DNA sequence: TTTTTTTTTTTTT
DNA sequence: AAAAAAAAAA
């Protein structure tokens, strides 16, 4: 075995043998721009230095001779061939092997070894592994010839990805398995880092692994540096290896060899070995001896005979000049074209993009990809080159292209139908040799044939990528031999499941990465402002791959909208930087002559002096370029016209034509129904045949605006379709907006794929002109609905969208059909820069949309008292049609639409077309109104004059103006509808006007004034509703009232008590049918929601309510610990639930109400600091949103008997929003309905009020509201009569064998549920025993009375708070004592670290059996509880001071604890008391969570001292019941805490006895049954102490009297 | 043998 | 201001 140096010393050591083996086969593979070519050339250089003959096979068609020479290759003697077929390439090798003249042969990319049949054939249908079988044959033939010739052969290979291999690594190597086996050495090279120079990237840090070794031990690895333009930093390696072997001394930063100091820092040491080649050889030799795991151990005149013989053979076989010496091959020299950016041309090193090569540009949407491309076309045409554009993205605007300076009339252009078509076109135009530069707009948009022909959902695993990989092989060869440049524009996609690196990729697999000679990364970095205006995009491009010069240089510049790249701008800056232009502050001078004042003018001057500009540019290029470059055309047009004939008789009548004459390319627009928006769009409206996205917050105007454009389009007679995936569109309101309901096609689809497939049908039909999809948010994938809630479908939704886009773009343009997607806003979490807002359904839509709108409600349109509309602002966020970032404001008047004439007045006054004399409005001298109100109304009345003003405004303000047959349309229309319905169900799509299931039905809320405030008269069936508010506000109560109401009409209800707090007895008191109310206390949140989904689908339940979304704890959270952070897991769960439920709730006509709690958002100073648990999903999907608040107390002299209540309608999809209702909740009774009725009746003048007297129709019915209410109670007949008239008078949107089948599907659902979520997860409330309320004595009798129930509730949460030393701990211990006396097990959590055992015992606690913990962290404390709860062994747990619950890291912690504990505490019947401190200006530590979840809340206070003449022996104490979910709240108890004894029981007994008249109090004397028992409370207490018998007797009577 | 494709979401005085 | 865990396609 003999070896050759690789040019890397460390690699030679890693090889064991000291180099690569002669007469053997070697493979090198790795990622793109890793070093494969470079390394190869270094070994050639090395071999030539010893005088060996080399050959290079540049199948990749990418080798740069000049760079090869820079690496130290003898160009003039390096044999080189760019073969046409793969067989040719290999046959050449076999000849050169057999010749025995060549010593080393390298083949650049087996990847590029395209079989003959593959080029000869098409692009599209393949021949899988007619390339692997070819390789396998080549190997067999070559092995023998290579050994007997002692000739080394190196194959360079690229990396591809084996799909979904979850066992080893997903990487392979092109050309099958043949090469793996035959190779004696296999190398894996990778770029691991950058070799930096402060600012500059001057090289690639490199690592090679020996992956196969037949010559020595395998799996050794070598690292080194590739210095761009120099090669492998050999001396660098040598320094390091030398120091490592102790041959070179390193004294800190000083390097010594044999006592002589040779450098300071690796930099100089390297340079020294460079200067002493003699000493360098000496060190290298010793290193090789020290580290090589094996030693190696008249004539050439015959070689040249057989050499020349082989070359003659080859050329008379494969063409005139198939193989020649690299140094003389002219077609190998690199030529460049300007990019239209000067700084980019400098960054490229070569001065521009390389001819006959492949280039990729990628970046975010609206970054400059298309624009930049067109600038290079413009540039190339200016020098007279022929260009072609492939608008696969179907989005190129001819007018804008011309504004950028492109010759439209001569720019060849094609909008292809399939991806294969697009690429086949290229291959024709390449081979033609007529075209010089071709650009393909979006490889993203290169949809494979099978994908368009298939459905949406049809999965084509890496079909797209495999197509690209084939295209590359075929094109490389044809592009070089034609000297034709090809630029691919690409989009960015996110790769999911990557935590290192960057999460960005590029569509169309890995093929393009490798074949591209240049790869550009363009990004918009800032806005080019004009005080107010945004006139351009600040832009930065990174050279990410470079086969032509050094990579990783970057260029910045400006794209001025409507003009292009600011070239002269660059030139000024570059000139000043190089000292060619003088800058004296704000003055710019060139060669003494002053040329401008400020960059603005200097630029304009260079514009005016093109001659001087060229002169400066040239000098800059000379000063700053890293690699300076350097009868006939009548034949071109022959082969051109020949290619075009070929193409059109292959891909259709007019598949390719000159851009300037293609009519279907011009842009047409439709009014949005907002004038100012039309101006902001520049073009005057939305573009036909394109895609548009509108997004914004909930109830912002997305649906409404959409309908207005439909209305507008129908007014001109266009056919529209609406896809109500959100399942929320109200036909009546749509009509009020002016939509033709009867002719508006409409579909509520079941799956997302269905929705999109429908579009694709309606697009292709060419019958529909405008289609709108309501909420991409609501486009739920098939698998998601078919799966459960919790089933994770990682970016399945987004991948679906991305496929939809590809298919739709083509069909929408060729049909001239507009498509608008409405989208919702979600928050992205873990972003601190930028804005935290996104858009559902991934990145696909961002790119494909031609217009992107951001709509927001900015204010209320008021009417003194009334809110009659939403002040609205829309921002143009993306614009492919005109300049972006203009914004429009206007009014949406509820029930009317966009105030168009409003806009018109304002715009008219602003342009001085309408005169405004204070409050008076004049047009052409004629006064038309007084105040905007009337002026608007006047333009309404004079539509003729209105058109006249509008037209002038449009002329004045539009930056981009535009100005037998239908019987065939209805054929293809009806054809599409038949298709659809026989595919997606009986009535999946129909005319809105006849769809009955679309009409709106309502249910009473149990509050009359709320029903009026709703406009519709109640809550909407088959929709989602949210009620939120502060704690004890009325949320649960109100809910139950609607259930009661619905049951009274015989509807089936279900309740989901996730809050675990519903009291059956109170529910019954409110008038609910307990025995028939289905009820579930679920364990996880997913369980709760899955239950709903079952009950929805069942169609048996009519109304479902979920108590606290706050309490919908995700599975993982319960299964995890307290402290385990689940970032927005809860919210993501909700968002999934919404998608699944909307569809099932409408088709079942089932109402769903979510009760929600209020949390505070922290770090907000504007607005209100209040939110709602469970993210943003529910905001959007809810058709009604209610805000309920307790505003006052309903008093009874002394007693508090109810809560004065106010509800605000905060969202309304059913009627006008923002009306509010007030009423009374009477504790234990419910909403005072008749109360409302009296007030409403008096207000409408139906009931007469003469001071305190109430009369109806002359008959006096009461004295004061009290009696009047009671009278209507007694006359239900007359009450109905008054209510009906009130409803007629005040409802703004007036309303709209069989049940035996229901119980079949009901029972079926319940069986399903219980065999899924446990033995008794759902049952009738009336029979659920675990739901009944049990109590424990507090140790204070008066407190037990004040509680109403007689004590604290088991299996619930309780909070006690108060000032310091008020009695919190003490009282707690008394209840423990009490509970232990009945034999319950207690636990105490002394987080306050202050509990005194001896005092606890004095209070009567069983110390020996009281479980007790002093925890270290707060999470620990709560986790302990959760364990003790779940154990079901402990009955009562108390936590001393939530104040003292210090988080580990040291409210969000509390909020998580609540969710987890509620469920575990009820199912264990375990009481939990939290003691809290005080921080009216009073609060409670640990946020708002506990307020809501507590069933009882106590306020204890020391009010006085219990004196003993001199001594203070106790604290006089008062407790207020502040919250009560168990009985009526706000009762208060007083008593005595005697220090060292406890709650002075006998004290209480004396007071209670005197109060009930059982004990006589004659001043200071206390008598019982005539017998005097004490003098002053002191002695009376002591007497009852002494007569325990009589004490029991009194207590018993008090209990009978007061319980 | 031949090949990738894609995000999803708040949480709290 | 400091937190992360998810996969199914010829
Ligand atoms: N002509 C050149 N001038 C300067 N640097 C180059 C040139 N060609 C390649 N390089 C650099 O050398 C490194 C490896 O290039 P190369 O060996 O072509 O990668 P591969 O062959 O693995 O695709 C890359 O960082 C690349 O930018
Ligand atoms: N027809 C037009 N008129 C004015 N500005 C435009 C037009 N088309 C695009 N632009 C602007 O040029 C910039 C880049 O657009 P483009 O080159 O189409 O990006 P990409 O192809 O990368 O999505 C954006 O700021 C965009 O708003
Ligand atoms: N049926 C209706 N009656 C009265 N006003 C409505 C109705 N539907 C919607 N609105 C009002 O129109 C505005 C926007 O509603 P919409 O277009 O549905 O918003 P989005 O679809 O963006 O959530 C809101 O202010 C809302 O109150
Ligand atoms: N079982 C009951 N007996 C008497 N009053 C009750 C009962 N349950 C609740 N209340 C009272 O009804 C009002 C609202 O209670 P609820 O609807 O549970 O509030 P929320 O669910 O909004 O926290 C409060 O004043 C509360 O004290
Ligand atoms: N170990 C003890 N011995 C005597 N008196 C005590 C003891 N602990 C508390 N007290 C008294 O009882 C009253 C209330 O105590 P405690 O219930 O601990 O108050 P809080 O828990 O509200 O701070 C105070 O006046 C206090 O001085
Ligand atoms: F790629 Al674009 F607007 F042309 F996102
Ligand atoms: F030489 Al390459 F991708 F194979 F840059
Ligand atoms: F998307 Al909406 F109200 F229609 F939030
Ligand atoms: F003494 Al304390 F809460 F203030 F127990
Ligand atoms: F029912 Al609550 F706070 F949500 F009392
Ligand atoms: Mg290479
Ligand atoms: Mg583009
Ligand atoms: Mg909507
Ligand atoms: Mg509640
Ligand atoms: Mg205490």
Ligand 10 atom at shortest distance from the alpha carbon of A1108: 4
Side-chain-side CA neighbours of residue A387 (13 Å): 26
- Domain with residue A1114: its CATH number is 3.40.50.300
B/e letters for A1410-1426, b = 16+ CB within 10 Å, e = fewer, are beebebebbbbbbbbbb
Are residues A1119 and A1265 located together in one domain of the fold?
no
Read off the tokens for A1149.
């006509």
> How do beta strands A1078-1080 and A1053-1056 pair?
parallel
> How do beta strands A887-893 and A897-898 pair?
antiparallel
Are residues A1530 and A1589 located together in one domain of the fold?
no
Q: What are phi and psi of A424, to 5 degrees?
A: -55, -40
Backbone CA torsion sign across A1276, A1280, A1281, A1286:
positive
Per residue, what are the HEC states of A678-722? HHHCCCCCEECCCEEEEECCCCCCHHHHHHHHHHHHHHCCCCEEE
Assess whether the C-beta atom of A880 lies below 6 angstroms from ligand 2: yes
Nearest to A208 by CA among A186, A238, A228: A186
Are residues A1507 and A1423 located together in one domain of the fold?
yes
Q: Which nucleotide is nearest to A463 (CA to C1')?
A: B3
Quote the domain boundaries for residue A261. Answer: 233-297
Are residues A1277 and A1351 located together in one domain of the fold?
no
| The last residue of a domain, from among A963, A982, A1014 | A963
Residue with tokens 């060849």: A412
Contact A803, A781 (CB under 8 A): no
Read off the tokens for A575.
């000139």
What is the H or E stretch that residue A28 is in?
strand A25-29
Are residues A402 and A422 located together in one domain of the fold?
yes
Resolution of this entry in Å? 3.4
Strands annotated E in A415-517: 437-440, 485-490, 492-494, 504-506
Q: Which residues, at least 6 apart from A1601, have a Cβ–Cβ distance to it below 8 Å?
A: A1556
Contact A362, A522 (CB under 8 A): yes
Distance CA A229, CA A6 (A): 18
Q: How far is the CA of A502 from the C1' of B7 (A)?
A: 14
DSSP 8-state assignment for residue A262: E
Strands annotated E in A732-865: 745-747, 770-773, 818-823, 825-827, 837-839, 851-863
Residue with tokens 């100089």: A268
The CB density around residue A286, as the number of other CB atoms within 10 Å, is 14
Helix ranges (DSSP H) in A1250-1332:
1264-1274, 1276-1290, 1300-1317
Judge residue A1317's burial from the number of C-beta atoms within 10 Å of its C-beta, 0-12 exposed, 13-18 middle, 19 or more buried: buried
Chain centroid, CA A1545 distance in Å: 62
Are residues A613 and A539 located together in one domain of the fold?
no
Q: What are phi and psi of A1562, to 5 degrees?
A: -95, 80
Read off the tokens for A576.
């000043």
Is residue A10 left, alpha or beta, with left meaning phi > 0 and alpha meaning psi from -120 to 50?
alpha
Residue with tokens 């960005």: A504
Q: How far is the CA of A1381 from the C1' of B10 (A)?
A: 47
Side-chain-side CA neighbours of residue A1053 (13 Å): 27
Give me the helix-helix angle, A1418-1431 and A1452-1466, nearest 10°: 10
Residues 1263-1322 of A with CB under 7 A from strand B: none
Angle at CA A1023, nearest 5°, toward A1022 and A1028?
A: 140
Distance CA A704, CA A687 (A): 19
Q: How far is the CA of A796 from the C1' of C7 (A)?
A: 9
Contact A440, A416 (CB under 8 A): no
Nearest to A599 by CA among A586, A609, A617: A586
| The last residue of a domain, from among A312, A333, A354 | A333
Assess whether the C-beta atom of A507 lies below 6 angstroms from ligand 6: no
Distance CA A806, CA A759 (A): 13
What is the H or E stretch that residue A782 is in?
helix A782-786
Contact A781, A751 (CB under 8 A): yes
Residue owning the nearest CA to atom 10 of ligand 1: A547
Q: How far is the CA of A1125 from the C1' of B12 (A)?
A: 13
Ligand 5 atom at shortest distance from the alpha carbon of A1366: 22
Assess whether the C-beta atom of A1402 lies below 6 angstroms from ligand 5: no
Q: Which residues, at least 6 apart from A746, have a Cβ–Cβ distance to it below 8 Å?
A: A721, A722, A723, A724, A729, A989, A990, A991, A992, A995, A998
Are residues A1056 and A1040 located together in one domain of the fold?
yes
Are residues A272 and A157 located together in one domain of the fold?
no
Distance CA A468, CA A514 (A): 12
Residue with tokens 């209540």: A1205
CB atoms within 5 A of ion ligand 14 belong to A 1035-1036
Strand order across the A851-863 sheet: A897-898, A887-893, A866-879, A851-863, A691-695, A818-823, A770-773, A720-723, A745-747, A989-991
The CB density around residue A172, as the number of other CB atoms within 10 Å, is 17
Distance CA A1392, CA A1444 (A): 5
Residue with tokens 């000496």: A282
Residue with tokens 């005169």: A915
Residues pairing with A421 in the sheet: none
Contact A486, A359 (CB under 8 A): yes
Are residues A522 and A651 located together in one domain of the fold?
yes
Distance CA A833, CA A827 (A): 13
- Quote the number of domains for chain A: 10
Nearest to A45 by CA among A69, A61, A26: A69
Residues pairing with A533 in the sheet: A530
What is the H or E stretch that residue A294 is in?
none
Assess whether the C-beta atom of A551 lies below 6 angstroms from ligand 1: yes
Contact A1459, A1058 (CB under 8 A): no
Read off the tokens for A328.
């003389």
Contact A507, A444 (CB under 8 A): yes
Nearest to A662 by CA among A391, A877, A432, A445: A391
DSSP 8-state assignment for residue A858: E
Are residues A1190 and A1278 located together in one domain of the fold?
no
| The last residue of a domain, from among A1275, A1309, A1332 | A1332
The per-residue DSSP string of A1338-1399 comes to: -S-HHHHHHTSSSSEETTSEEEEE-STTSSHHHHHHHHHHHHHHTT--EEEE-TTS---HHH
Q: Does A1469 contact strand B, using a CB cutoff of 7 Å?
A: no
- Domain with residue A918: its CATH number is 3.30.250.10
**Residue numbers belonging to the annotated binding site of A:** 30-37, 363-370, 696-703, 1029-1036, 1362-1369
Distance CA A909, CA A952 (A): 12
Contact A19, A12 (CB under 8 A): yes
Residues pairing with A1472 in the sheet: A1357, A1437
Are residues A736 and A789 located together in one domain of the fold?
yes
The CB density around residue A52, as the number of other CB atoms within 10 Å, is 16
Contact A1122, A1422 (CB under 8 A): yes
Are residues A769 and A828 located together in one domain of the fold?
yes
Q: Give distance in angstroms: CA of A1511 to centre of ligand 15.
A: 24
B/e letters for A470-483, b = 16+ CB within 10 Å, e = fewer, are bbbbbbbbbbbbbe
Chain centroid, CA A1284 distance in Å: 49
Nearest to A616 by CA among A584, A585, A570: A570
> How do beta strands A770-773 and A720-723 pair?
parallel
The CB density around residue A627, as the number of other CB atoms within 10 Å, is 18
């Amino acid at each position: 075995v003999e070896t050759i140096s690789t040019g890397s010393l460390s690699l030679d050591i890693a090889l064991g043998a000291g180099g690569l083996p002669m007469g053997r086969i070697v493979e090198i593979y790795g990622p793109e721009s890793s070093g494969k070519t470079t390394l190869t050339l270094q070994v050639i250089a090395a071999a030539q230095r010893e005088g060996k003959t080399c050959a290079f096979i540049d199948a990749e068609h990418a080798l740069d001779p000049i760079y090869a020479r820079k690496l130290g290759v003898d160009i003039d003697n390096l044999l080189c061939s760019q073969p046409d077929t793969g067989e040719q390439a290999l046959e050449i090798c076999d000849a050169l092997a057999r010749s025995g003249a060549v010593d080393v042969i390298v083949v650049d990319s087996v990847a590029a070894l395209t079989p003959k049949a593959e080029i000869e054939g098409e692009i599209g249908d393949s021949h899988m592994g007619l390339a692997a079988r070819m390789m396998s044959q080549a190997m067999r033939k070559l092995a023998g010839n290579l050994k007997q010739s002692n000739t080394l052969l190196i194959f360079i290979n690229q990396i591809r990805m084996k799909i979904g291999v979850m066992f080893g690594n997903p990487e392979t190597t092109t050309g099958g398995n043949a090469l793996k086996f035959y190779a004696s050495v296999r190398l894996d090279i990778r770029r691991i880092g950058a070799v930096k120079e402060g600012e500059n990237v001057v090289g690639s840090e490199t690592r090679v692994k020996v992956v196969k070794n037949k010559i020595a031990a395998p799996f050794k690895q070598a690292e080194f540096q590739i210095l761009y333009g120099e090669g492998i930093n050999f001396y660098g390696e040598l320094v390091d290896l030398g120091v490592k072997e102790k041959l070179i001394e390193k004294a800190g930063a000083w390097y010594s060899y044999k006592g002589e100091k040779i450098g300071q820092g690796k930099a100089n040491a390297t340079a020294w070995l460079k200067d002493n080649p003699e000493t360098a050889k000496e060190i290298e030799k010793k290193v090789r001896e020290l580290l090589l795991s094996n030693p190696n151990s008249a004539i050439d005149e015959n070689k040249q005979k057989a050499l020349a013989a082989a070359l003659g053979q080859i050329e008379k076989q494969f063409g005139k000049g198939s193989i020649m010496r690299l140094g003389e091959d002219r077609s190998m020299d690199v030529e460049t074209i300007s990019t239209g950016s000067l700084s980019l041309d400098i960054a490229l090193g070569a001065g521009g993009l390389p001819m006959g090569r492949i280039v990729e540009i990628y970046g975010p949407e609206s970054s400059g990809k298309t624009t930049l491309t067109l600038q290079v076309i413009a540039a190339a045409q200016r020098e007279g080159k022929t260009c072609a554009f492939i608008d696969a993205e179907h989005a190129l605007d001819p007018i804008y292209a011309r504004k950028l300076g492109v010759d439209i009339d001569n720019l060849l252009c094609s909008q292809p139908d399939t991806g294969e078509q697009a690429l086949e076109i290229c291959d024709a135009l390449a081979r033609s040799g007529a075209v010089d530069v071709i650009v393909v707009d979006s490889v993203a948009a290169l949809t494979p044939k099978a994908e368009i022909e298939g459905e949406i959902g049809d999965s084509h695993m890496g079909l797209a990528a495999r197509m690209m990989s084939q295209a590359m092989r075929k094109l490389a060869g044809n592009l070089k031999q034609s000297n034709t440049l090809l630029i691919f524009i690409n989009q960015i996609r996110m790769k999911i499941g990557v935590m290192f690196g960057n999460p960005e990729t590029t569509t169309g697999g890995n093929a393009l990465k490798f074949y591209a000679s240049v790869r550009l990364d363009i990004r918009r970095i800032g806005a080019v402002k004009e005080g107010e205006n945004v006139v351009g995009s600040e832009t930065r491009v990174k050279v990410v791959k470079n086969k032509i010069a050094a990579p990783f240089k970057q260029a910045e510049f400006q794209i001025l909208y409507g003009e292009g790249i600011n070239f002269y701008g660059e030139l000024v800056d570059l000139g000043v930087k190089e000292k060619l232009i003088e800058k004296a502050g704000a003055w710019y001078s060139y060669k003494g002559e002053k040329i401008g004042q400020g960059k603005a003018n200097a630029t304009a001057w260079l514009k005016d002096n093109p001659e001087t500009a060229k002169e400066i540019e040239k000098k800059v290029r000379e000063l700053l370029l890293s690699n300076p470059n350097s009868a006939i055309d009548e034949n071109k047009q022959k082969a051109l016209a020949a290619a075009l004939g070929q193409i059109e008789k292959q891909f259709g009548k007019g598949s390719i034509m000159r851009l300037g004459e293609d009519r279907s390319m011009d842009v047409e627009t439709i009014s949005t129904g907002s004038l100012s928006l039309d101006i902001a769009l520049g073009a005057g409206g939305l573009p036909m045949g394109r895609i548009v996205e509108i997004y914004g917050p909930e109830s912002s105007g997305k649906t409404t605006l959409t309908l207005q454009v439909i209305a507008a389009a129908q007014r001109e007679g266009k056919t529209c379709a609406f896809i109500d995936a959100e399942h929320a569109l109200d036909p009546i309101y749509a009509r009020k907006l002016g939509v033709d309901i009867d002719n508006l096609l409409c579909s509520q689809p079941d799956t997302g794929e269905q929705a999109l497939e429908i579009c694709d049908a309606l697009a292709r039909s060419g019958a529909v002109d405008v289609i709108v999809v309501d909420s991409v948010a609501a486009l739920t994938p098939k698998a998601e609905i078919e799966g459960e809630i919790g089933d994770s479908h990682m970016g399945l939704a987004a991948r679906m969208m991305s496929q939809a886009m590809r298919k739709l773009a083509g069909n929408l343009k060729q049909s001239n059909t507009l498509l608008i997607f409405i989208n919702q806003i979600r928050m992205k979490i873990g972003v601190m820069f930028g804005n935290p807002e996104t858009t559902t359904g991934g990145n696909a839509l961002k790119f494909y949309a031609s217009v992107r709108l951001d709509i927001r409600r900015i204010g209320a349109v008021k009417e003194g008292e009334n809110v009659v509309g939403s002040e609205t602002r829309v921002k143009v966020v993306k614009n492919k049609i005109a300049a972006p970032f203009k914004q429009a404001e206007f009014q949406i008047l509820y029930g009317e639409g966009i105030n168009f004439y409003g806009e018109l007045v304002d715009l008219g006054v602003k342009e001085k077309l309408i005169e405004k004399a204070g409050a008076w409005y004049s047009y052409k001298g004629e006064k038309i109104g007084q105040g905007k109100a009337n002026a608007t109304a006047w333009l309404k009345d004079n539509p003729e004059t209105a058109k006249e003003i509008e037209k002038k405004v449009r002329e004045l303000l539009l930056s981009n103006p535009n100005s037998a047959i239908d019987e065939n349309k209805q054929k293809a229309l009806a054809a599409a509808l038949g298709q659809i319905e026989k595919q997606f169900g009986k009535g999946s799509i129909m005319r809105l006007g006849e769809d009955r299931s679309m009409d709106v039905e309502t249910i009473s809320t149990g509050s009359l004034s709320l029903d009026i405030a709703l406009g519709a008269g109640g809550l909407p069936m088959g929709r989602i509703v949210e009620i939120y508010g502060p704690e004890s506000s009325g949320k649960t109560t109100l809910t139950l009232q609607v259930i009661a109401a619905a049951q009274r009409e015989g509807k089936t209800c279900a309740f989901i008590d996730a809050e675990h707090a519903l009291d059956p007895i109170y529910a019954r008191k409110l008038g609910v049918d307990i025995d028939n109310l289905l009820c579930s206390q679920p364990d996880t949140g997913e369980q709760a929601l899955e239950i709903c989904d079952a009950l929805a689908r069942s169609g048996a339940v009519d109304v479902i309510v979920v108590d606290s979304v706050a309490a919908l704890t995700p599975k993982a959270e319960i299964e995890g610990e307290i402290g385990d952070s689940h970032m927005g897991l809860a919210a993501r769960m909700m968002s999934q639930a919404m998608r699944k439920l909307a569809g099932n709730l409408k088709q079942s006509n089932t109402l769903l109400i979510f009760i929600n709690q209020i949390r505070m958002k922290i770090g907000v100073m504007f607005g209100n600091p209040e939110t709602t648990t469970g993210g943003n999903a529910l905001k959007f999907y809810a058709s009604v949103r209610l805000d309920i608040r307790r505003i006052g107390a309903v008093k009874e002299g002394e007693n508090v008997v109810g809560s004065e209540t106010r509800v605000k309608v905060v969202k309304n999809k059913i009627a006008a929003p923002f009306k509010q209702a007030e009423f009374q909740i009477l504790y234990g009774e419910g909403i005072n309905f008749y109360g409302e009725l009296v007030d409403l009746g008096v207000k409408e003048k139906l009931i007469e009020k003469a001071g305190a007297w109430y009369s109806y129709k002359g008959e006096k019915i009461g004295q004061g509201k009290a009696n009047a209410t009671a009278w209507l109670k007694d006359n239900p007949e007359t009450a109905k009569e008054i209510e009906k008239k009130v409803r007629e008078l005040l409802l703004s949107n007036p309303n709209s064998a069989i049940d035996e089948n229901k119980q079949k599907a009901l029972a079926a659902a319940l069986g399903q549920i219980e065999k899924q979520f446990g033995k008794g997860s759902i049952m009738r409330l009336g029979e659920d025993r675990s739901m009944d309320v049990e109590t424990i004595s507090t140790g204070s009798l008066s407190l037990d009375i004040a509680l109403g129930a007689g004590g604290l509730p088991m299996g619930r949460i309780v909070e006690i708070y108060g000032p310091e030393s008020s009695g919190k701990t003490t009282l707690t211990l008394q209840v423990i004592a009490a509970a232990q006396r009945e034999g319950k097990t207690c636990a105490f959590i002394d987080a306050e670290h202050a509990l005194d055992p001896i005092y606890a015992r004095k209070l009567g606690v069983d110390i020996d059996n009281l479980l007790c913990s002093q925890p270290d962290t707060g999470e620990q404390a709560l986790e302990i509880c959760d364990a003790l709860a779940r154990s079901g062994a402990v009955d009562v747990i108390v936590v001393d001071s939530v104040a003292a619950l210090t988080p580990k890291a040291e409210a969000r912690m509390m909020s998580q604890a609540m969710r987890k504990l509620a469920g575990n505490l009820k199912q264990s019947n375990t009481l939990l008391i939290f003691i809290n401190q005080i921080r009216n200006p009073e609060t409670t530590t640990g946020g708002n969570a506990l307020k809501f979840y507590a069933s009882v809340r106590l306020d204890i206070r020391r009010i006085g001292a219990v004196k003993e003449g001199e001594n203070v022996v106790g604290s006089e104490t008062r407790v207020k019941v502040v919250k009560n979910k168990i009985a009526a709240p706000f009762k208060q108890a007083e008593f005595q805490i005697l220090y060292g004894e406890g709650i002075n029981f006998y004290g209480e007994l004396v007071d209670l006895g005197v109060k009930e008249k059982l004990i006589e109090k004659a001043g200071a004397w206390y008598s019982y049954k005539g017998e005097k028992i004490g003098q002053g409370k002191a002695n009376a207490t002591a007497w009852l102490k002494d007569n325990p018998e009589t004490a029991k007797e009194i207590e018993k009577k008090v209990r009978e009297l007061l319980l």
